[PDB]
Design a protein around this ligand. Structure first.
Ligand code: 63F
Length: 559
């Protein structure tokens, strides 16, 4: 079956969409080459629709069936609870698409009477009807990128049910999604890790092999490759859990009326077509993709005969580290792995490449790199090309955005040369200029939403990355060059200009005392020759990373 069928109605916007990077003096101080920066809009939705629409080939073999049996046996050990309306209401991210039934995300989060009454009626309908297709809205996602030399990218398409339904999905399945992937894949479940644990996992996996070979596997439009039978098997896996009788019913209804497919409506209420694949904006998107990718990859590793595989899976992101059998055999065994994945309806985007250096693997848009701490000890950390984070940071300084990628990037990429010298310096000077140091901000990290005050960044970074995050130096030539080439391309000031700017930022923060002085001391110790002694921050031990800062969860894409 075709992943999509279209009517000719266009994917339409809700409000005006700006494609060009807006400019103000502060955003320009970060990046001057504004013409290279763009936002994706509904104008390119037609281009994305052609890429994501294809027929699926699915031939399951004994290797696939063997892994599915292990997953179902592992799933039987899970006990998951039905969430109450209130609980599901509190997990709703701020700014998620309002309901067409007269209430929005704010009403849901406040447990407003009107929102709760509607959600309750949606839930009763899921218990009484297991068949009628649920309507979905299709929107073109607005995301910021820098133009590429070889290739603007078309907008990604987001398919989501109404807000009331989204809350019901958490009531029936939030507890399943929070427990099932870890129970099923153990150490291979990538979402349990911080950046420091992911790097430790990859380095340890690499060192455990006699002659390691690794690869990232890029599935072409993963969501579209997900078949009706893949979605029905995810439901069969969910049912292996010890569940409440009402959750079992709602899970079946959600699968048959929404997850497997259904009608697509644009923002103007016109019929856009029909979906027979993964919806990008459902609670089970991330969990379902993680499970389905793990099943197909584990079976494909066996079908290819790859020796001693260690896998790390994050949604559709897959990385495999195995025991090399020589370059000719590895290239042939990777083609056999690809052929098996293709047969399982997971064909490649870019064909995988065997890598013999851990640093040359890109996975979760990142790579392993090395630096040294204050004692000169070797430290492995995760980094990436800063182009996209910098372009988005410039947009976010010119325009107030509900969700700030800059904050999530400073958090996830805190040990990096670029996040420290550029992102930290820039945002703390902008927060000083605007008097917003104490204002809590929203950010999203792979669907997990957080509400964080910039003044809490130092204890957050210490708890997440460790004290070494404030003392890394002696970055690699490749890393330095990648950042430096990025600055020249984007019109971003050189690192030495950022160092001088940071010394002024640092002084202003120190003079404010309290939490601001801690920001100046810890985050900007790299900017001074005469180093301050960085002792554990007391607030780092008091906090709880996972629970104190949570603003909810979106199982799939934005809105
Ligand atoms: O969809 C999910 N589950 C469904 C499928 C079943 C889901 C999604 C996210 C998520 N989390 C918690 C763990 N962490 S976390 O980093 O420990 C962290 C914890 C607290 C915190 O709090 C703050 F914000 F307050 F600091 C901030 C961060 C984040 C993460 O995505 N990790 C993986 C990862 C790690 C490194 C990577 O690589 C590179 F580093 F390059 F990005 C890429 C991915 C966010 N948990 N679950």
């Amino acid at each position: 079956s075709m992943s999509y069928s279209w009517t000719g109605a266009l994917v339409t916007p809700c409000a005006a969409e700006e494609q060009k990077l807006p400019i103000n003096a502060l955003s320009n101080s970060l990046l001057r080459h504004h013409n290279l920066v763009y936002s994706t809009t509904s104008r390119s939705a037609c281009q994305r629709q052609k890429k994501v629409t294809f027929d699926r080939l699915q031939v399951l073999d004994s290797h696939y069936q063997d892994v599915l049996k292990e997953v179902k046996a592992a799933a039987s050990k899970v006990k998951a609870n039905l969430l109450s309306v209130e609980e599901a209401c509190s997990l709703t991210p701020p700014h998620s698409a309002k309901s067409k039934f007269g209430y929005g995300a704010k009403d849901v989060r406040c447990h407003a009477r009107k929102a709760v009454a509607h959600i309750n009626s949606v839930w009763k309908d899921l218990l009484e009807d297991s068949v009628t297709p649920i309507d979905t809205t299709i929107m073109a996602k607005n995301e910021v990128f820098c133009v590429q030399p070889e290739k603007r990218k078309p907008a990604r398409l987001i398919v989501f049910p109404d807000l009331g339904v989204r809350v019901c999905e958490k009531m029936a399945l939030y507890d399943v999604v929070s427990k099932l992937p870890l129970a099923v894949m153990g150490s291979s479940y990538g979402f349990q890790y911080s950046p420091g644990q992911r790097v430790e996992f990859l380095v340890q996996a690499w060192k455990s092999k006699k002659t390691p070979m690794g690869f990232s596997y890029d599935t072409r439009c993963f969501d579209s490759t997900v078949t009706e039978s893949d979605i029905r098997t995810e439901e069969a896996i969910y049912q292996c859990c010890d569940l409440d009788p009402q959750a079992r019913v709602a899970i079946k209804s959600l699968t048959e009326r929404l997850y497997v497919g259904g009608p697509l409506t644009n923002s103007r209420g016109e019929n856009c077509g029909y979906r027979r694949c993964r919806a990008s904006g459902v609670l089970t998107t991330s969990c379902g993709n993680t499970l389905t990718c793990y099943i197909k990859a584990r079976a494909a590793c066996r079908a290819a005969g790859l020796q001693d595989c260690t896998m790390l899976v994050c949604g559709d992101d897959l990385v495999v580290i195995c025991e090399s059998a020589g370059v000719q055999e590895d290239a042939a065994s990777l083609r056999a792995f690809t052929e098996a994945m293709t047969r399982y309806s997971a064909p490649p985007g870019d064909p995988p490449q065997p890598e013999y250096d851990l640093e040359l693997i890109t996975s979760c848009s990142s790579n392993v790199s090395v630096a040294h701490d204050g004692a000169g000890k070797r430290v492995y950390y995760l980094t990436r090309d800063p182009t996209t984070p910098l372009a988005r940071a410039a947009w976010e300084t010119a325009r107030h955005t509900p969700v700030n990628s800059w904050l999530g990037n400073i958090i996830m990429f805190a040990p990096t040369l670029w996040a420290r010298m550029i992102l930290m310096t820039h945002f703390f000077s902008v927060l000083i200029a605007r008097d917003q140091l104490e204002q809590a901000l929203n950010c999203e990290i792979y669907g997990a939403c957080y509400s964080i005050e910039p003044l809490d960044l130092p204890p957050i970074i210490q708890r997440l990355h460790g004290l070494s995050a404030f003392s890394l130096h002696s970055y690699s030539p490749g890393e330095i060059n990648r950042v430096a080439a990025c600055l020249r391309k984007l019109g971003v000031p050189p690192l030495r200009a950022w160092r001088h700017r940071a010394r002024s930022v640092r002084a202003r923060l120190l003079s404010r005392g309290g939490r601001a002085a801690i920001c100046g001391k810890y985050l900007f110790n790299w900017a001074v020759r005469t180093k301050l002694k960085l002792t554990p921050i007391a607030a780092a031990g008091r906090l709880d990373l996972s629970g104190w800062f949570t603003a909810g969860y979106s199982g799939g894409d934005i809105y």
